[PDB]
Design an enzyme around this catalytic site. Structure first.
Site, PDB file in Angstrom:
ATOM      1  N   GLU A   8       0.804  -1.215   0.000  1.00 16.59           N
ATOM      2  CA  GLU A   8       0.000   0.000   0.000  1.00 16.59           C
ATOM      3  C   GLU A   8       0.838   1.266   0.000  1.00 16.59           C
ATOM      4  OE1 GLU A   8      -3.150  -0.003  -0.378  1.00 16.59           O
ATOM      5  OE2 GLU A   8      -3.655  -2.077   0.086  1.00 16.59           O
ATOM      6  N   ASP A  42      -5.833   6.703  -5.124  1.00 21.55           N
ATOM      7  CA  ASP A  42      -5.365   5.327  -5.243  1.00 21.55           C
ATOM      8  C   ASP A  42      -5.390   4.882  -6.707  1.00 21.55           C
ATOM      9  OD1 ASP A  42      -8.023   4.574  -5.755  1.00 21.55           O
ATOM     10  OD2 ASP A  42      -8.276   3.547  -3.847  1.00 21.55           O
ATOM     11  N   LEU A  51      -8.635   4.167   2.386  1.00 18.59           N
ATOM     12  CA  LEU A  51      -9.614   4.782   1.500  1.00 18.59           C
ATOM     13  C   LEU A  51     -10.492   5.761   2.282  1.00 18.59           C
ATOM     14  CD1 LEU A  51     -11.206   4.882  -1.170  1.00 18.59           C
ATOM     15  CD2 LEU A  51     -12.516   2.927  -0.344  1.00 18.59           C
ATOM     16  N   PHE A  89      -8.419  -6.381   2.480  1.00 15.28           N
ATOM     17  CA  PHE A  89      -8.009  -4.996   2.675  1.00 15.28           C
ATOM     18  C   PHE A  89      -8.099  -4.222   1.367  1.00 15.28           C
ATOM     19  CE2 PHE A  89      -5.495  -2.177   5.499  1.00 15.28           C
ATOM     20  CZ  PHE A  89      -5.121  -1.215   4.584  1.00 15.28           C
ATOM     21  N   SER A 129     -12.178 -19.759  -6.646  1.00 13.66           N
ATOM     22  CA  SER A 129     -10.888 -19.605  -5.981  1.00 13.66           C
ATOM     23  C   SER A 129     -10.985 -19.990  -4.516  1.00 13.66           C
ATOM     24  CB  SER A 129     -10.411 -18.159  -6.078  1.00 13.66           C
ATOM     25  OG  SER A 129     -10.179 -17.770  -7.414  1.00 13.66           O
ATOM     26  N   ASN A 185      -6.418 -19.831 -10.889  1.00 15.70           N
ATOM     27  CA  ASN A 185      -7.780 -19.306 -10.906  1.00 15.70           C
ATOM     28  C   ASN A 185      -7.844 -17.866 -10.401  1.00 15.70           C
ATOM     29  OD1 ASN A 185     -10.792 -19.256  -9.501  1.00 15.70           O
ATOM     30  ND2 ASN A 185     -10.691 -20.402 -11.429  1.00 15.70           N
TER      31      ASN A 185
END
Ligand code: NA
Length: 164
Positions: A11, A20, A32, A104, A117, A132
């Site tokens: 990040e 972002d 965010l 996250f 998945s 996948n």
């Protein structure tokens, strides 16, 4: 390596409001603020989140405090989601960090919808899960980060975070 260091690598750390990868106002370690195109709206969110008039700038300690809360929120969102919790509970500690990382970045609802998945991860079919997971908007839009997270699921090691 641990979940905090891993998400700090993915990040970054910025002390002023920035956009972002999706164009949304963000601050700190990927915190965010809002999806609104209004910087004024982002500024209200920031002052509310920090508890003072920040004028769009925060300290490193403040960024780390939001990050503490945001990691907790990702874990909580996993535990409260009926699709994510069984997968999380089935995983070892390193692969749990990979799942927290996904949540996250994209939120509990988005990750919870990856039923194929998630099934492969629960089955411990690591190579199949990795193939996948790459068939995703996530992988195409943030491939270097997704590759690191996927390698973590594939191997159960922190090898993708070693030179960073
Ligand atoms: Na990337």
């Amino acid at each position: 390596m641990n979940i905090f260091e891993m998400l700090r690598i993915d990040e970054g750390l910025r002390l002023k409001i920035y956009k972002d990868t999706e164009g949304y106002y963000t601050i700190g370690i990927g915190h965010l603020l809002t999806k609104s195109p209004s910087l004024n709206a982002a500024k209200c969110e920031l002052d509310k989140a920090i508890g003072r008039n920040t004028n769009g700038v925060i300290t490193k300690d403040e960024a780390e405090k939001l990050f503490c809360q945001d990691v907790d929120a990702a874990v909580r969102g996993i535990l409260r989601n009926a699709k994510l919790k069984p997968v999380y509970d089935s995983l070892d500690c390193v692969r749990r960090a990979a799942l927290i990382n996904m949540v996250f970045q994209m939120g509990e609802t988005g990750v919870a919808g990856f039923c194929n998945s998630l099934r492969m991860l629960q089955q411990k079919r690591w190579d199949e899960a990795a193939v996948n997971l790459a068939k995703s908007r996530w992988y195409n839009q943030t491939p270097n980060r997704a590759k690191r997270v996927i390698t973590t699921f594939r191997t159960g090691t922190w090898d993708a975070y070693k030179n960073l």
